[PDB]
From TrEMBL:
<feature type="binding site">
    <location>
        <position position="396"/>
    </location>
    <ligand>
        <name>Zn(2+)</name>
    </ligand>
</feature>
<keyword id="KW-0479">Metal-binding</keyword>
<dbReference type="InterPro" id="IPR025706">
    <property type="entry name" value="Endoa_GalNAc"/>
</dbReference>
<keyword id="KW-0106">Calcium</keyword>
<keyword id="KW-0378">Hydrolase</keyword>
<feature type="binding site">
    <location>
        <position position="319"/>
    </location>
    <ligand>
        <name>N-acetyl-alpha-D-galactosamine</name>
    </ligand>
</feature>
<feature type="binding site">
    <location>
        <position position="355"/>
    </location>
    <ligand>
        <name>Ca(2+)</name>
    </ligand>
</feature>
<protein>
    <submittedName>
        <fullName>Alpha-N-acetylgalactosaminidase</fullName>
        <ecNumber>3.2.1.-</ecNumber>
    </submittedName>
</protein>
<dbReference type="GO" id="GO:0046872">
    <property type="term" value="F:metal ion binding"/>
</dbReference>
<keyword id="KW-0326">Glycosidase</keyword>
<feature type="binding site">
    <location>
        <position position="467"/>
    </location>
    <ligand>
        <name>N-acetyl-alpha-D-galactosamine</name>
    </ligand>
</feature>
<dbReference type="Pfam" id="PF18952">
    <property type="entry name" value="DUF5696"/>
</dbReference>
<feature type="binding site">
    <location>
        <position position="311"/>
    </location>
    <ligand>
        <name>Ca(2+)</name>
    </ligand>
</feature>
<keyword id="KW-0862">Zinc</keyword>
<feature type="binding site">
    <location>
        <position position="260"/>
    </location>
    <ligand>
        <name>Ca(2+)</name>
    </ligand>
</feature>
<feature type="binding site">
    <location>
        <position position="434"/>
    </location>
    <ligand>
        <name>Zn(2+)</name>
    </ligand>
</feature>
<feature type="binding site">
    <location>
        <position position="360"/>
    </location>
    <ligand>
        <name>N-acetyl-alpha-D-galactosamine</name>
    </ligand>
</feature>
Amino acid sequence: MMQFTMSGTMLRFDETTLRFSFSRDGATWSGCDGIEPQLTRESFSFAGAATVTHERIETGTGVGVRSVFAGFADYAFETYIWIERSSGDVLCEWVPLRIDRVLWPAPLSFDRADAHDVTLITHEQGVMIPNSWPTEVGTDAVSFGGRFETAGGYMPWFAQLRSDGHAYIAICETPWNAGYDIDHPAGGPYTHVGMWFEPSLGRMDYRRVVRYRLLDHADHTAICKTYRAYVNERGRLRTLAEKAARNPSVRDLLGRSWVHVGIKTNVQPDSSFYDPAQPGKNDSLVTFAQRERQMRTLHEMGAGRLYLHLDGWAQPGYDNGHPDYLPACREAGGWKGMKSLIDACHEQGDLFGTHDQYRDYYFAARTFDPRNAIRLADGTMPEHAMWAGGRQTYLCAELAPDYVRRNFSEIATHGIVLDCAYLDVFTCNEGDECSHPEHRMTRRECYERRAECFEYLLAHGILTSSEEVSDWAVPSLVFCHYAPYDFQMRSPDAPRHGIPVPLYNLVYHDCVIQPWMMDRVAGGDDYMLYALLNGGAPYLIRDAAYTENDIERCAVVAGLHRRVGMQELVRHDLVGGDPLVQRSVFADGTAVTCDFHAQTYEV
Ligand SMILES: [Ca+2]
Ligand SMILES: [Zn+2]
């Protein structure tokens, strides 16, 4: 049993049982009784080590315990758990030495009850999940198994807050092969939240580091402010302002209303979406001519300022032939009708973006070669046929920019000036690992190659879009398809995982523009309230791949956007401790209040 006191915090670490605990400002947190730090293969505790060494350490930078673990059959690794002098933070390092996952640090005890002490997780826009919450919240119920750099982990942190206002945030400083793990039992007494780490390309390769910061007199607002600061203290908090200094078009997205509609549909036979009764469900076409007149009419009706995202615009048809997604669909009016539509949009003060796809790599593609595809760490090629274009694998992001550069050249060759562009999935799904000797790529590398893809667009004054908003992309992404809450991605019938809190826009409102769902759910929540509280852009039309007081509703949300769209969301609060009735405050003092009993808002 070692003990360390440094810079206002105290660390405790048990020599023999491995359970560690920290304290600062008189609040103690502790590893749960009965959860071992583990390794996995086809589960061994750390204590399972044939040899275990512990060395007390004082460096000029902090103090703590280094531990070596050999054994298990031959394998070895190391942990370093220390207090940083400058700040008071505790840092946990797992250190390869030479295995499927690593679950370490072991989760902190946050049992139990007391409806007001909450877990904050980062699964899409925030989820504030109180310890007494009725519904079960597990990792199986979280997108992509709770994996950072995805929809299941918008930001590489989680946090636990007590009624006391005594919190800890946990920041993953090595996210690219990592995620968090959540166990909140239905109505549970406790919520346990823990970090997990996977090998990169078959091997734990690089050290993995978690940074804990204990907070006192703490808000959920404040917990997000800590991360924001961490991010900027590392130069990855890219504002719209910074983006705007390079491409002022960023400013033209404020106040805009979103129209998402498409041109061609063409479900293939091998596709999961194919049924033989009937075709015509499998084939549909709306022409450029029709979308022209659509956009015409929306202006005439007073829709206002608009951005048109255009699905299915190329010849093979929506979700077909990627990356050979050329030419612009003939049967809808070829390059010409497309050219004419784009012209028309600009001609009435409206913006336009293409829908494109560079991860999904179809066999039906004109240029398909298995030589350009992903190979997993076991050297296999992944295959599915979930989507419209049928059989596919994934294109190694190592080759992604080649294809972005080639395609958008062709597009521009035909007098088409894209305002924006949407490269699909990049910002929602995980980075691939690629083991192909001819283009080896780690998950870290994959996000950089995706960002290189975005940056080519930015270089051509073409704004940037993708599915969702995983923070890796923050420096190269202008806007998204949405940054919704988890509950908006489930049937409104589904029991929810917690209180919706805008944890993300708390961190990035002033960095990435998001359109929002405008739906009303019968017998419940109007999704306009969430757009408001999140100071976002409104959807007017949202035609899915698989007007009626709308304009009047949009123009409310749009107007607030123009005022606030680039500003920091400084505060979000729950009016009088009640989960419904929430307030969010922006940089310029604007307070959007939203009553969830009354379905009302106040601007
Ligand atoms: Ca789309
Ligand atoms: Zn590759």
